Amino acid sequence: FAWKMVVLSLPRIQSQRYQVGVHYELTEEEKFYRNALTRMPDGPVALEESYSAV
Amino acid sequence: SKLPSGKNILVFGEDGSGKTTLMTKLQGAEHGKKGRGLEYLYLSVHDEDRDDHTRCNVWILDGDLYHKGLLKFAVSAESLPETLVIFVADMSRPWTVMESLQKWASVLREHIDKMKIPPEKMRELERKFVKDFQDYMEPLGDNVLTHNLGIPVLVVCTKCDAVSVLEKEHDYRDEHLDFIQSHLRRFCLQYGAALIYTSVKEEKNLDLLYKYIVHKTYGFHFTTPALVVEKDAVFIPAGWDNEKKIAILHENFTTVKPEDAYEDFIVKPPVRKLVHDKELAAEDEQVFLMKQQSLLAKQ
């Protein structure tokens, strides 16, 4: 679990960050790259291959 | 004769519903970090009579259909009869609770056909679960246990401290609560499931949940009867309910019908649209200055 938090806890790029006042909180998907597993180029089988060794 | 081990816990729910923070307080750990994909944990189950300690592993699945292929490592074919399934529903967003239930049920139904179990073993398991349902103490019906899996299942409702936010800034009444509890009682009756209402902010039925897992996974003695009056601490175990214990909730229905669908009465609130598609698109220069050439010629 610690090796995947290096990428998965990276802060996302915020476009309109200069505005202030709106008291909404962005979710975890739009604050950090929590959809990086869906962008896996070989499909989810690399995560299956990673879990297979445990 | 030592106590059996290898008892499996299968947690299913949407992401952000608070499954990890529920499991770290059921187990007793301080910081349960929400690792994504699958989470691995075990339950500290022990008895004071035989002085024996049993390890019962916990498998948590995140709310993502892209990770539905991870279930092969969580449960196998041989680990199926030693698996107790907890289905997690979060009524903090009460508009989409049994949707997650039926989609995880369909996922479990297609996944239980993936290893191609022979028709004798799961029929024996279904017969065992049917006789365990019929022998509860404090043929079947038309819609009772019609979608049985053969293994003990459970539906646990989370954030019971989040009942007041439903009433105050959404203008909910007791008919609102009765409508959502009737549908899940129908689901529990259809699937042979139980219901424990639990809040971790208000610390309600957490040890009652823990004793229920210990009893349903190890045959421990159970004495707590069904609770229906306390709407924040509802306890409906397996075998208590029937087609007439759901009909008592239809008396307070003055504007809604029990036979109606779900999404017609309770609607999810519309949310903020990404209002940025107004954009700015300056024209191509060629057509723009042909138009300006026409304006040059016409005047």
Curated annotation (Swiss-Prot), chain A:
It is found in: Cytoplasm, Cytoskeleton. Transmembrane segments: none annotated. It is linked to Charcot-Marie-Tooth disease, axonal, type 2O: An axonal form of Charcot-Marie-Tooth disease, a disorder of the peripheral nervous system, characterized by progressive weakness and atrophy, initially of the peroneal muscles and later of the distal muscles of the arms. Charcot-Marie-Tooth disease is classified in two main groups on the basis of electrophysiologic properties and histopathology: primary peripheral demyelinating neuropathies (designated CMT1 when they are dominantly inherited) and primary peripheral axonal neuropathies (CMT2). Cortical dysplasia, complex, with other brain malformations 13: An autosomal dominant disorder characterized by global developmental delay with impaired intellectual development. Some patients show signs of peripheral neuropathy, such as abnormal gait and hyporeflexia. CDCBM13 is associated with variable neuronal migration defects resulting in cortical malformations. Homodimer. The cytoplasmic dynein 1 complex consists of two catalytic heavy chains (HCs) and a number of non-catalytic subunits presented by intermediate chains (ICs), light intermediate chains (LICs) and light chains (LCs); the composition seems to vary in respect to the IC, LIC and LC composition. The heavy chain homodimer serves as a scaffold for the probable homodimeric assembly of the respective non-catalytic subunits. The ICs and LICs bind directly to the HC dimer and dynein LCs assemble on the IC dimer. Interacts with DYNC1LI1; DYNC1LI1 and DYNC1LI2 bind mutually exclusive to DYNC1H1. Belongs to the dynein heavy chain family. Cytoplasmic dynein 1 acts as a motor for the intracellular retrograde motility of vesicles and organelles along microtubules. Dynein has ATPase activity; the force-producing power stroke is thought to occur on release of ADP. Plays a role in mitotic spindle assembly and metaphase plate congression. Dynein heavy chains probably consist of an N-terminal stem (which binds cargo and interacts with other dynein components), and the head or motor domain. The motor contains six tandemly-linked AAA domains in the head, which form a ring. A stalk-like structure (formed by two of the coiled coil domains) protrudes between AAA 4 and AAA 5 and terminates in a microtubule-binding site. A seventh domain may also contribute to this ring; it is not clear whether the N-terminus or the C-terminus forms this extra domain. This is Cytoplasmic dynein 1 heavy chain 1. It comes from Homo sapiens (Human). The lineage of its organism: Eukaryota, Metazoa, Chordata, Craniata, Vertebrata.
UniProtKB/Swiss-Prot annotation, chain B:
GO terms for molecular function: ATP binding; dynein heavy chain binding; identical protein binding. Transmembrane segments: none annotated. The chain holds residues 49 to 373 of 492 of the full protein. It comes from the Eukaryota. Signal peptide: none annotated. It comes from Homo sapiens. This is Cytoplasmic dynein 1 light intermediate chain 2. Acts as one of several non-catalytic accessory components of the cytoplasmic dynein 1 complex that are thought to be involved in linking dynein to cargos and to adapter proteins that regulate dynein function. Cytoplasmic dynein 1 acts as a motor for the intracellular retrograde motility of vesicles and organelles along microtubules. May play a role in binding dynein to membranous organelles or chromosomes. One of its GO terms (biological process) is microtubule-based movement. Homodimer. The cytoplasmic dynein 1 complex consists of two catalytic heavy chains (HCs) and a number of non-catalytic subunits presented by intermediate chains (ICs), light intermediate chains (LICs) and light chains (LCs); the composition seems to vary in respect to the IC, LIC and LC composition. The heavy chain homodimer serves as a scaffold for the probable homodimeric assembly of the respective non-catalytic subunits. The ICs and LICs bind directly to the HC dimer and the LCs assemble on the IC dimer. Interacts with DYNC1H1; DYNC1LI1 and DYNC1LI2 bind mutually exclusive to DYNC1H. Belongs to the dynein light intermediate chain family.
